[PDB]
Design a binder for these strands. Structure first.
Ligand SMILES: Cc1cc2c(cc1C)N(C[C@H](O)[C@H](O)[C@H](O)COP(=O)(O)OP(=O)(O)OC[C@H]1O[C@@H](n3cnc4c(N)ncnc43)[C@H](O)[C@@H]1O)c1[nH]c(=O)[nH]c(=O)c1N2
Length: 452
DNA sequence: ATCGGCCGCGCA
DNA sequence: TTGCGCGAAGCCGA
């Protein structure tokens, strides 16, 4: 392995027990530097390796959609892990408390976890550390270049980062060694329970039939690769030319998978790098899964207040501040955005996409978020509403990409200043009639007339 | 260090 | 739609 992928959280004396992978971000058996390094740590100690996963009360914040998607992936995983002689454990409760006392009851010798920049994982690590005595290691198994090596600071923009990332690629774009099995050694309750809790929340139509359409993305690792293979076969060729067209389905659709870690962007890059297509579409594509995915981890990592206004740049703040007192053309409540009840049938279209399919088109996520700012009573409330709805309804929600992209949208983060307007100040602008020139908006709107 | 280099709209 | 030069605007980094 490349040792720069490991960062020791806590130094201690190794016990003669198992090596415990605390799986959290990367829910896949294959192409997992964290599970691979736990195996290795467990090989040269003549100890087994085990995976432990903590199911927290964070599901009641979102929807059945994300909760099945994650719990069906887990159920596949369990078989995969088990076929490698790796037992996998499922703790119901609070990582800080639960993993600690688990490390206790099993006499773990070493503790490993994947990397994730979201505030709450630092809280749980920091509590975990304060209650164990064995080494605690962290591995970046989500980014091609570990987040702390691509950049030490907050990168102001894509092209300040892009050079630093691309110097390090020859060294970190490597092949994955295969998970060598162990030599020595209840999820269906958890599903049916958690579903009965979420059920009063489900998004129904005027009739009981649920809004959510689950047949657009199957969960799991096996699914995730048939999406990557199909992309490379079918859509990668035209990606750079038709990605901004919400009517052609040319996106890679891999983002529900990556969020849950059911597939490795490192594998995707390896596979794309070796595919033969339009160079500009590889170039377009690598830049999203390479520069924009990982600058998003950098954003949350180096700015703990990423889900708030303060993390904007001083020009964006100063600008939005001066237009706090402007007269909003319209003002809608959260409930009114949430139900696609604005004057903008194109905007209600996109929210209709988000509502029923669980994934809004990459281009329309920009428009949808800017109009939220334009038609709310304050930037803070606009952030508050874009965050809530992105996370409540998007299958890829609750993700660094999420905050890094609402922050681009509402706040200039990783962007520049444009001509000054009412309400929006100097934040980039998007218009109905700018979409008219780029794609058949009449056709998007027709797709989604599920407003009942 | 000094300066290039990151949507909307007219027009053909 | 389909591409281009132009516009408004701030700041990094070489
Ligand atoms: C308002 C708003 C809200 C969100 C987001 C953007 C905006 C403007 N994003 C980011 C982006 O819009 C999203 O990754 C794509 O819609 C994912 O669809 P595909 O995987 O099909 O992208 P596509 O195949 O075109 O891109 C490939 C990959 O590049 C990365 N990427 C693309 N666009 C990016 C962006 N703008 N920022 C960061 N990484 C990017 C992702 O890893 C994506 O899987 C996001 N993404 C996400 O997964 N979860 C979320 O909750 C949000 N939230």
């Amino acid at each position: 392995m490349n040792p720069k992928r490991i960062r020791a959280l806590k130094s201690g004396k190794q016990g003669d027990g198992p090596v415990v992978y605390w799986m959290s971000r990367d829910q896949r058996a294959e192409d997992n530097w964290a599970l691979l390094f736990s195996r290795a740590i467990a090989k040269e100690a003549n100890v087994p390796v085990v995976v432990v996963f903590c199911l927290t009360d964070e599901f009641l914040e979102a929807g059945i959609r994300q909760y099945e998607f994650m719990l069906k992936g887990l159920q596949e995983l369990e078989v995969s892990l088990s076929r490698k002689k790796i037992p996998s454990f499922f703790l119901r409760g609070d990582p800080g408390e639960k993993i600690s006392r688990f490390v206790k009851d099993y006499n773990a010798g070493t503790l490993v976890t994947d990397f994730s920049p979201l505030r709450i994982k630092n809280q749980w690590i920091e509590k975990v550390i304060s209650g164990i005595s064995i080494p605690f290691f962290e591995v970046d198994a989500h980014n091609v270049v570990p987040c702390w090596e691509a950049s030490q600071k907050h990168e102001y923009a894509a092209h300040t980062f892009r050079p630093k990332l691309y110097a390090l690629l020859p060294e970190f774009l490597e092949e994955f060694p295969e998970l060598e099995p162990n030599s020595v050694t209840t999820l269906s309750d958890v599903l049916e329970t958690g579903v009965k809790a979420l059920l009063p929340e489900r998004a129904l139509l005027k009739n009981k039939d649920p809004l959510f359409e689950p047949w657009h993305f199957e969960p799991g690792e096996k699914a995730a690769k048939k999406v990557m293979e199909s992309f490379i076969a079918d859509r990668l060729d035209s990606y750079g030319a038709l990605r901004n067209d919400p009517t052609k389905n040319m996106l890679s659709n891999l983002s529900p998978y990556l969020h849950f870690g059911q597939i490795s962007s490192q594998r995707v890059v390896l596979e794309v790098e070796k595919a033969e297509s339009n160079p500009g579409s590889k170039k377009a594509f690598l830049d999203e899964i390479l520069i924009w995915k990982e600058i998003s981890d950098n954003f949350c990592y180096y700015n703990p207040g990423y889900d708030g206004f303060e993390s904007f740049p001083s020009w964006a703040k100063e600008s939005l501040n001066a237009h706090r007192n402007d007269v909003r053309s319209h003002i809608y409540t959260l409930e009114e955005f949430e139900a696609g009840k604005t004057h903008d049938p194109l905007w209600n279209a996109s929210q209709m996409e988000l509502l029923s399919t669980g994934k809004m088109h990459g281009y329309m996520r920009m428009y949808w978020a800017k109009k939220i700012l334009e038609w709310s009573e304050s930037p803070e409330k606009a952030l508050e509403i874009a965050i809530c709805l992105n996370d409540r309804y998007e299958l890829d929600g609750r993700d660094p990409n999420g905050y890094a992209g609402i922050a681009w949208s509402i706040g200039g983060v990783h962007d520049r200043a444009w001509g000054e307007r009412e309400v929006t100040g100097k934040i980039r602008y998007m218009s109905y009639e700018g979409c008219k020139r780029k794609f058949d908006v009449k056709l998007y709107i027709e797709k989604y007339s599920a407003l009942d």
